[PDB]
Coordinates of N, CA, C and O in Angstrom, one line a residue:
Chain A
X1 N -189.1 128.0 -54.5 CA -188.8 129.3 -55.0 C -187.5 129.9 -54.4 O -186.8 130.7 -55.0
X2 N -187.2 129.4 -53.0 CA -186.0 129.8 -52.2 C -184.7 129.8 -53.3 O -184.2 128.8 -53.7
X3 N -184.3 131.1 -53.5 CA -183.0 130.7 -54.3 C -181.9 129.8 -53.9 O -181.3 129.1 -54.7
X4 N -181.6 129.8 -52.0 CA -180.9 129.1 -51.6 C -181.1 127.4 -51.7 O -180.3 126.5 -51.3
X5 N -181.7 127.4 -52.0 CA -182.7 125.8 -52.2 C -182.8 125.2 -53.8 O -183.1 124.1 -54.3
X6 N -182.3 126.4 -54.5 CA -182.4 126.0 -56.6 C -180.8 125.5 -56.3 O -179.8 126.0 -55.7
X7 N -181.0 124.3 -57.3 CA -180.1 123.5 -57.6 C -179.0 123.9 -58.6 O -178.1 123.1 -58.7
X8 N -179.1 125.3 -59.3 CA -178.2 126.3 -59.9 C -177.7 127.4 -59.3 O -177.3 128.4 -60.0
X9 N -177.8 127.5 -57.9 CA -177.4 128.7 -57.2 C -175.6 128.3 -57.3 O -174.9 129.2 -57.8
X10 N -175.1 127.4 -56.9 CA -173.6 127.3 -56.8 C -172.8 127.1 -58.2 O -171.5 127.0 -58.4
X11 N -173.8 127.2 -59.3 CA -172.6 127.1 -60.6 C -173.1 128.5 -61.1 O -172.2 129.1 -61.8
X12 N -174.6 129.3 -60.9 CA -174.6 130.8 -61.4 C -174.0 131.5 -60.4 O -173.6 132.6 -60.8
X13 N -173.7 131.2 -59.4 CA -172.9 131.9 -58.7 C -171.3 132.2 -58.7 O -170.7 133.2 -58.4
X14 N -170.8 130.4 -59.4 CA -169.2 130.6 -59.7 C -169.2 131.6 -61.2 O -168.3 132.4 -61.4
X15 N -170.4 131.5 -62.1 CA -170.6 132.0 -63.5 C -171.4 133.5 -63.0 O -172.5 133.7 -62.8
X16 N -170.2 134.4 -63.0 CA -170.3 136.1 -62.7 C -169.5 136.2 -63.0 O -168.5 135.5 -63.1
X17 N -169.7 137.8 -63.6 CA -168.5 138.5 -64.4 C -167.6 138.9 -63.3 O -166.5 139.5 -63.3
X18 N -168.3 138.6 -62.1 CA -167.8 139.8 -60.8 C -167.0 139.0 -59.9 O -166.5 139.3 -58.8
X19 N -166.8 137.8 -60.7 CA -165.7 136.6 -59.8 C -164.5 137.1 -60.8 O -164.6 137.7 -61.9
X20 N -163.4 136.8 -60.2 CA -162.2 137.1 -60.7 C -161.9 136.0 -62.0 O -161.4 136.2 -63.1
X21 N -162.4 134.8 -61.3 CA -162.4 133.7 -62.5 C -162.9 134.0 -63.6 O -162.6 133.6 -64.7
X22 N -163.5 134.5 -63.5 CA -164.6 135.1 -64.7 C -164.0 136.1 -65.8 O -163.7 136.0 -67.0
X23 N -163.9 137.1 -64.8 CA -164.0 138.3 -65.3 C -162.4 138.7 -65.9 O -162.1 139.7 -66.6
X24 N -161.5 137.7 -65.6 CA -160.1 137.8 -66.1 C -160.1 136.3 -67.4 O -159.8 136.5 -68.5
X25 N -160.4 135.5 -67.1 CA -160.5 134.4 -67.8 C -161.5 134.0 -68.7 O -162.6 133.7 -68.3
X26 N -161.1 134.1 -70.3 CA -162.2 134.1 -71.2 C -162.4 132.3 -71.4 O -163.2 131.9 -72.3
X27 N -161.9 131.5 -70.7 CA -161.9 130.1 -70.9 C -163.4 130.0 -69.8 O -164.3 129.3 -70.1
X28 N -163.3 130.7 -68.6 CA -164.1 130.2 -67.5 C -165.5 130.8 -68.1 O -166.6 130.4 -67.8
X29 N -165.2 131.5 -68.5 CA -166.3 132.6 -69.3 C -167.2 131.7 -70.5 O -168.4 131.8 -70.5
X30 N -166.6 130.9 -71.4 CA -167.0 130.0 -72.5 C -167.4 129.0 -72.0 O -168.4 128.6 -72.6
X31 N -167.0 128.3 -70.9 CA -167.9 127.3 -70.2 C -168.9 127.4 -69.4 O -169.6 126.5 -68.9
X32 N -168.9 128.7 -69.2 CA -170.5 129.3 -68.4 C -171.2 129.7 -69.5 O -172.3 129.2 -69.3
X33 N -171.2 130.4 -70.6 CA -171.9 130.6 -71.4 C -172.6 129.1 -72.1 O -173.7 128.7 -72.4
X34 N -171.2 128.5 -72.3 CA -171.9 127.0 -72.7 C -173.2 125.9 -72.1 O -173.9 124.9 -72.5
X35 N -173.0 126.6 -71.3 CA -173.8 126.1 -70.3 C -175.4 126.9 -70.7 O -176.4 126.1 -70.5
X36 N -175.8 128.3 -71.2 CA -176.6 128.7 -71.4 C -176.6 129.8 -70.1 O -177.6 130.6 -70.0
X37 N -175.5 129.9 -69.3 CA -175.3 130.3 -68.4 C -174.4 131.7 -69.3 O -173.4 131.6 -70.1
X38 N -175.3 133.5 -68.7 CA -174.5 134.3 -69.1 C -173.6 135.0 -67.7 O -174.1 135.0 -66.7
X39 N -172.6 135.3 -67.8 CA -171.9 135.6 -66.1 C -172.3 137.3 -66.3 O -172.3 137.9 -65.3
X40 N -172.7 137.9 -67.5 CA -173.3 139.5 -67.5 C -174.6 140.5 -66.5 O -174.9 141.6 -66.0
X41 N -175.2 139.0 -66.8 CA -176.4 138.9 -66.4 C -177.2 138.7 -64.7 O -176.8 137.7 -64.3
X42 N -177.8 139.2 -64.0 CA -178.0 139.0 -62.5 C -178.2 137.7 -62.2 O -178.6 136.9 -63.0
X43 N -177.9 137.3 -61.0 CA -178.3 135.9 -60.9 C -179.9 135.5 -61.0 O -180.2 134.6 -61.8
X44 N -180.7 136.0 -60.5 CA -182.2 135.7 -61.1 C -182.4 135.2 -62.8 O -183.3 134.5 -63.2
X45 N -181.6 135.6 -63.4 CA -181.8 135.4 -64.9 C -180.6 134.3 -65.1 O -180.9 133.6 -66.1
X46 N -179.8 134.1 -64.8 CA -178.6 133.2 -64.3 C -179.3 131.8 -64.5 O -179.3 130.9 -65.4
X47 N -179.9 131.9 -63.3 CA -180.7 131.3 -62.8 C -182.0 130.3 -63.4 O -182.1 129.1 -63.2
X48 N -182.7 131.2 -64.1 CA -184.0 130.9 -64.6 C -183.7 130.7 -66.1 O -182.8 131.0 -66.8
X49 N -185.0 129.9 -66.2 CA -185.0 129.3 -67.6 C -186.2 129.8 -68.7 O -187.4 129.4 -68.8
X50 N -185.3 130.8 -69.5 CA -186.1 131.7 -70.1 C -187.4 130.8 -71.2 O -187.4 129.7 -71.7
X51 N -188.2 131.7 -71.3 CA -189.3 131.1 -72.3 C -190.0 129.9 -71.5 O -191.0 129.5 -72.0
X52 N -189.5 129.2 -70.4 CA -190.2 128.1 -70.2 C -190.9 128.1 -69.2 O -190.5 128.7 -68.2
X53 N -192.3 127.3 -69.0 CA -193.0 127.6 -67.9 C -193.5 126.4 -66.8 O -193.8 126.5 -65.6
X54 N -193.2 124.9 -68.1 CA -193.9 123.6 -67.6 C -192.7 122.7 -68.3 O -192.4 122.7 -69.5
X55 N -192.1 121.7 -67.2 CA -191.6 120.5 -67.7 C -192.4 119.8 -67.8 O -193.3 119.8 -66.9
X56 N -192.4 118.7 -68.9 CA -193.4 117.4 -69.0 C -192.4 116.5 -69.1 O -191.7 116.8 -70.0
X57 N -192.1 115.5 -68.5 CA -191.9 114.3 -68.9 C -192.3 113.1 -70.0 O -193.5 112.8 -70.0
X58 N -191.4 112.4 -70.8 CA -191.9 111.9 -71.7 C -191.2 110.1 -71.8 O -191.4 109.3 -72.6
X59 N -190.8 110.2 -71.1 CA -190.3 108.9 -70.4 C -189.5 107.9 -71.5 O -189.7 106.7 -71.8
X60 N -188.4 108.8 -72.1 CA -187.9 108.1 -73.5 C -186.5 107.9 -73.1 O -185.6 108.7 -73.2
X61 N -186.3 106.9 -72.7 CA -184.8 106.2 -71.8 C -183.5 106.8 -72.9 O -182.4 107.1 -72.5
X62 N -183.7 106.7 -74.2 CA -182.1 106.6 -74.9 C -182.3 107.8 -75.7 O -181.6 107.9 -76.7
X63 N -183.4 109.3 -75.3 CA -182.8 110.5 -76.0 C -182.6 111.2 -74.3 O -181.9 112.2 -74.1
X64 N -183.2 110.3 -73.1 CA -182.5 111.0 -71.9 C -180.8 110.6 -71.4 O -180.2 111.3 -70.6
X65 N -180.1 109.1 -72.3 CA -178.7 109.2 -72.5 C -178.3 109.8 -73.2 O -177.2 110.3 -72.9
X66 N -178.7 110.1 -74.3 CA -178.3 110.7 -74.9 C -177.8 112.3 -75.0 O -176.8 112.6 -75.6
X67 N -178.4 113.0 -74.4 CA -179.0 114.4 -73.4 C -177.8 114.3 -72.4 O -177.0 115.2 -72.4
X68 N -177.6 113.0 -71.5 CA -176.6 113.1 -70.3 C -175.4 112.7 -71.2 O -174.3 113.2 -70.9
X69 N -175.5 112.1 -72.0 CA -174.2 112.3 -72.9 C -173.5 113.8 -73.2 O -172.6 114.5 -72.7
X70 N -174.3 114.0 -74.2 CA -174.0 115.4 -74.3 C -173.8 116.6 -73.7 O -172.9 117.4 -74.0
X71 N -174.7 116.7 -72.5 CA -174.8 117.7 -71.6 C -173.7 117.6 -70.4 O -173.1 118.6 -69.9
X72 N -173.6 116.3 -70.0 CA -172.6 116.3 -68.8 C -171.6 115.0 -68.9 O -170.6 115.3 -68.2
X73 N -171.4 113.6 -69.5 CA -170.3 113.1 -69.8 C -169.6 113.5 -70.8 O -168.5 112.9 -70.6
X74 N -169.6 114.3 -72.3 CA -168.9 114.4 -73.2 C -169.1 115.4 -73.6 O -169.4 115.4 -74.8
X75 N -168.9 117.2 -72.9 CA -169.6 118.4 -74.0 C -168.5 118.8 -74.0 O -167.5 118.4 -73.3
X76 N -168.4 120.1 -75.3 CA -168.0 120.7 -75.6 C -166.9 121.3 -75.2 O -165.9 121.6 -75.9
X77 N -166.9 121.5 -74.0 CA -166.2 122.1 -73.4 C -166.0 121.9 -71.8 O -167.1 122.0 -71.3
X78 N -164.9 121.6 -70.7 CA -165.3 121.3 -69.7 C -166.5 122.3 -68.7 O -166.6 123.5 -68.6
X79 N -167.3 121.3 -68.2 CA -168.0 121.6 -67.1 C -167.3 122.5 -66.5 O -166.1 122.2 -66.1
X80 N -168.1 123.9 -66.3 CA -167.5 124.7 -65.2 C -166.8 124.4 -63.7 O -167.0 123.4 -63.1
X81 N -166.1 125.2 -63.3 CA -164.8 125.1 -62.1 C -164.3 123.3 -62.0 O -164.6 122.6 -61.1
X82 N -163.5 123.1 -63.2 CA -163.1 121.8 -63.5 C -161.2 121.9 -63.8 O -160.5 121.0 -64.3
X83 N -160.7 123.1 -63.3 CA -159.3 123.1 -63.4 C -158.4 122.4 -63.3 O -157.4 122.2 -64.0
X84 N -158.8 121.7 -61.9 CA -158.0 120.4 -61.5 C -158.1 119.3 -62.1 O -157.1 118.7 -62.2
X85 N -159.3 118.7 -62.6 CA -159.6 117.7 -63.5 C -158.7 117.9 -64.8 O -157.9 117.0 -65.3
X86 N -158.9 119.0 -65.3 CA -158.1 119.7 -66.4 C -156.9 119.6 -66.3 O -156.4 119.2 -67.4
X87 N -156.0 119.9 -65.2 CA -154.5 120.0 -65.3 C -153.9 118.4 -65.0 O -152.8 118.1 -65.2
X88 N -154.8 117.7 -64.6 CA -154.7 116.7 -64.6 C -154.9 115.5 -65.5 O -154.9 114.3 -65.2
X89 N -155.2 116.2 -67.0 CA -154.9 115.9 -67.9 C -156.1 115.5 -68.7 O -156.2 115.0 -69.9
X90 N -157.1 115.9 -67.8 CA -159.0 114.8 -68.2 C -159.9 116.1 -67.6 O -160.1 116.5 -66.5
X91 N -160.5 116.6 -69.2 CA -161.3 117.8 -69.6 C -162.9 117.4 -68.8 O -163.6 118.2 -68.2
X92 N -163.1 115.8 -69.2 CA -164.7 115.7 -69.1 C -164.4 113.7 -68.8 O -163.4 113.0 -68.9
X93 N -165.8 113.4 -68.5 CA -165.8 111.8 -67.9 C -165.7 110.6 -69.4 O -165.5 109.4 -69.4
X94 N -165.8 111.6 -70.7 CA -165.3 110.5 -71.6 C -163.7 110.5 -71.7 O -163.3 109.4 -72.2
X95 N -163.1 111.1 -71.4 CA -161.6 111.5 -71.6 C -161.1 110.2 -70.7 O -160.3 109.4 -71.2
X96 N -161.5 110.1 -69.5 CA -160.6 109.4 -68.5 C -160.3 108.0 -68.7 O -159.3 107.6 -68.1
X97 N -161.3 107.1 -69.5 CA -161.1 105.7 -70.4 C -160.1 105.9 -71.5 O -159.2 105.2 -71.9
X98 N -160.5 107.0 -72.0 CA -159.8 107.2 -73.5 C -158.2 107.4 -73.0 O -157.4 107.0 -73.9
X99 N -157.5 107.9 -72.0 CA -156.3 108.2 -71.5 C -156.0 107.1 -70.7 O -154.9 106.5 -70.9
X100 N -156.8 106.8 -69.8 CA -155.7 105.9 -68.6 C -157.2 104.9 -68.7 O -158.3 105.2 -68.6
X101 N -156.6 103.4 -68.9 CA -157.7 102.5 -68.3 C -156.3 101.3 -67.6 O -155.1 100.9 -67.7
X102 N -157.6 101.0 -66.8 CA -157.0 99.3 -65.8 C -157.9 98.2 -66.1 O -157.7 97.1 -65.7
Chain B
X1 N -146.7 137.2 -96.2 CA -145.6 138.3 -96.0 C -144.3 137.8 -96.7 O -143.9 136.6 -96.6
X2 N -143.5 138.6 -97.5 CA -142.7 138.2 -98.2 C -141.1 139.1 -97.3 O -139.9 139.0 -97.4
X3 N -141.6 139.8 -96.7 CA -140.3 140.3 -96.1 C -140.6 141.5 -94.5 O -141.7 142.0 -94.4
X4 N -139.7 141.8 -93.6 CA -140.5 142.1 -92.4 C -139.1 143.2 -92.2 O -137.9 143.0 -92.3
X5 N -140.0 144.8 -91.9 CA -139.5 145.9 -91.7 C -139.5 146.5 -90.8 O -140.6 146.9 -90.5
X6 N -138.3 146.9 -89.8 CA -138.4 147.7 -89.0 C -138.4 148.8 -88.6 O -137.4 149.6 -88.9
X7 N -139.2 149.2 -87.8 CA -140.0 151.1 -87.6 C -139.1 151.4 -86.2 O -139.3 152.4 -85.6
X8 N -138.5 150.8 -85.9 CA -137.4 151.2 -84.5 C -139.2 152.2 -83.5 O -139.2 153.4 -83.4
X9 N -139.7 151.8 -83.3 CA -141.2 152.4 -82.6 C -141.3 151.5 -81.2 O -142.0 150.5 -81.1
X10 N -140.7 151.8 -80.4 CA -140.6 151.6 -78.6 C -142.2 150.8 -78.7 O -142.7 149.8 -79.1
X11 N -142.6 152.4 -77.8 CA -144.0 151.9 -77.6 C -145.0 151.1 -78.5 O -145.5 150.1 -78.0
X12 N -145.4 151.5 -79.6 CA -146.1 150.3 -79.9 C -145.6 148.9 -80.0 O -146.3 148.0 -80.3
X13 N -143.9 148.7 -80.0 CA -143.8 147.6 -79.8 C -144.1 146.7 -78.1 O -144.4 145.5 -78.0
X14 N -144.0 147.6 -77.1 CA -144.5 147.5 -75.6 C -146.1 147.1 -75.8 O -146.5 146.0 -75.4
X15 N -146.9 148.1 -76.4 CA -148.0 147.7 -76.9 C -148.6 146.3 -77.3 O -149.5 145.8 -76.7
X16 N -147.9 145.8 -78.5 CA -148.0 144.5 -78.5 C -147.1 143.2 -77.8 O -147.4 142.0 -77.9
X17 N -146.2 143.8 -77.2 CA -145.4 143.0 -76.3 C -146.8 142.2 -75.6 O -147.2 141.0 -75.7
X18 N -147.5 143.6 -74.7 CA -148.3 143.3 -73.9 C -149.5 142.4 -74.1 O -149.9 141.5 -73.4
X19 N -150.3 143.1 -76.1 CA -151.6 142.4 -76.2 C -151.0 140.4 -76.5 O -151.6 139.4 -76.0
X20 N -149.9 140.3 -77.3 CA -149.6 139.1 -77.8 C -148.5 137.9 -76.3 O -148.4 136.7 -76.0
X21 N -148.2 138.7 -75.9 CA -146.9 137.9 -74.7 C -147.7 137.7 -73.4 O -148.2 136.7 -72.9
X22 N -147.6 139.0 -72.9 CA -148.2 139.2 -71.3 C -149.6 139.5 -71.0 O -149.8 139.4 -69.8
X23 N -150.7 139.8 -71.8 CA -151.5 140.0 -71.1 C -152.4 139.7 -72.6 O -152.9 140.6 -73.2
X24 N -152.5 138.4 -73.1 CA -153.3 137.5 -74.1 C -154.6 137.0 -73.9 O -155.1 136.7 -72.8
X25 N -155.2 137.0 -74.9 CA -157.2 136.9 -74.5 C -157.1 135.4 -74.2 O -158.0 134.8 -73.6
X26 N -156.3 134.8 -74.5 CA -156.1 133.3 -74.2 C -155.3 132.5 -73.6 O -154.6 133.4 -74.1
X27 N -154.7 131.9 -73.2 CA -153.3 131.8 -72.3 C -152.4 131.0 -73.5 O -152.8 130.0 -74.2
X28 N -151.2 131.5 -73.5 CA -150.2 130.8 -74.3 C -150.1 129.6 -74.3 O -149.9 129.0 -73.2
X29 N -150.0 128.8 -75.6 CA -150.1 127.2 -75.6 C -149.1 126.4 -74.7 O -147.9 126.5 -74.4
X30 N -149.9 125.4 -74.4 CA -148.8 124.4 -73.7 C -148.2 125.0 -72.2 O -147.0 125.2 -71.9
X31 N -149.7 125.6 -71.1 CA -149.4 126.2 -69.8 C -150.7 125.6 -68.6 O -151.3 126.1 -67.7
X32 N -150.5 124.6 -69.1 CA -152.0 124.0 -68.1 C -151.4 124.3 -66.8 O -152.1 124.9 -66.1
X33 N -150.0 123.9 -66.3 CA -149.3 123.7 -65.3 C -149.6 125.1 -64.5 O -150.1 125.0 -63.3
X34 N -149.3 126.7 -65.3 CA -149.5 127.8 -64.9 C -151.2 128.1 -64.5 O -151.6 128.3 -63.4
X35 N -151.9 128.0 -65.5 CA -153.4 127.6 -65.4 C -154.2 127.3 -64.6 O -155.2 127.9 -64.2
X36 N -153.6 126.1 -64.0 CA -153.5 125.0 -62.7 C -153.1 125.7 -61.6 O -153.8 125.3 -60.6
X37 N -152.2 126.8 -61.2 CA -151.7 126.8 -60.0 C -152.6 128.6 -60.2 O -152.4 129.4 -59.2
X38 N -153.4 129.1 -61.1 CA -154.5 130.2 -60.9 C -154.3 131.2 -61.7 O -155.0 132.2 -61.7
X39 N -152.6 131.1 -63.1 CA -152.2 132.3 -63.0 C -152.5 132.1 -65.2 O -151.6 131.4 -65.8
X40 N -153.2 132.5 -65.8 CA -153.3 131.9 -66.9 C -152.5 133.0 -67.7 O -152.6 132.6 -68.9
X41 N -151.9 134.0 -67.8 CA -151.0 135.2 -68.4 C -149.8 135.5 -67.5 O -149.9 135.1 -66.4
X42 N -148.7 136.0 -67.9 CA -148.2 137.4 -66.7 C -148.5 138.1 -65.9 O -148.1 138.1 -64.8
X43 N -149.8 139.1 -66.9 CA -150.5 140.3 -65.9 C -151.3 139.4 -64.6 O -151.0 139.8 -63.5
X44 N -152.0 138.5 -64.6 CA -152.3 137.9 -63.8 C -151.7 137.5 -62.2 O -152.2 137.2 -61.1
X45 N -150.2 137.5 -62.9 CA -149.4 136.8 -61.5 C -149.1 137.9 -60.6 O -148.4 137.7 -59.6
X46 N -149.4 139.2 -60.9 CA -149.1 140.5 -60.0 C -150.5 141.0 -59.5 O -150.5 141.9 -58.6
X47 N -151.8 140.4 -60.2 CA -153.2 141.0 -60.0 C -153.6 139.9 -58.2 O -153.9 140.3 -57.0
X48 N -153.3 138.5 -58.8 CA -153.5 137.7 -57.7 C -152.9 137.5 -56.5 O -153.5 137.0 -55.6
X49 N -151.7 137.8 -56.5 CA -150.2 137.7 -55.5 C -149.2 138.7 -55.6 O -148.7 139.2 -56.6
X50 N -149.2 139.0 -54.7 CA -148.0 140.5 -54.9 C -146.9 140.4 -53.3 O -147.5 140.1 -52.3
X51 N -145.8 140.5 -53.2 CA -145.0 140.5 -52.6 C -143.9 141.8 -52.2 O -143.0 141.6 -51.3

């Protein structure tokens, strides 16, 4: 239950309206919300995963690629505090084959 | 628009100077470079660093 110990404390933390990144930039703003992540909102709610009470596991190998596809190698929009990756020409981990391969 | 008229109007031209040039809900295309080094508008580069 230690907030310092939840595995979303360092990205609801970068996603606040009360960070400069945030709160001036409506790009850093769309990738925290994308996330399901609101920066308006306190971090306890940030944080927590509304409506839900119980994960179950269901042990289905290719809608859990599927899920990491979407969610963290190829979404929408870059993964939050990703500027550098960005200016460097590569938004997300499908971009970096599609641009430069060896 | 078939033709564009001018109201000689200072201020609200400063006005949208500001909302469309310098201080934009989105940063002007083709500025990753500016973006990159923290500064994504104008208004920005006087909020963050000042000399």
């Amino acid at each position: 239950e230690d907030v310092r110990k939840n595995r979303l404390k360092p990205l609801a933390t970068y996603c606040s309206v009360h960070n400069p990144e945030i709160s001036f930039k409506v790009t850093n703003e769309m990738q925290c919300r994308e996330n399901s992540i609101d920066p308006t909102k306190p971090l306890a709610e940030r944080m927590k995963i509304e409506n839900c009470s119980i994960i179950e596991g269901t042990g289905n190998f290719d809608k859990c690629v599927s899920q990491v596809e979407s969610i963290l190698v190829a979404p929408k929009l870059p993964l939050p505090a990703n500027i550098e990756a960005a200016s460097s020409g590569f938004e997300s981990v499908d971009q970096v084959f599609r641009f430069a391969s060896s």
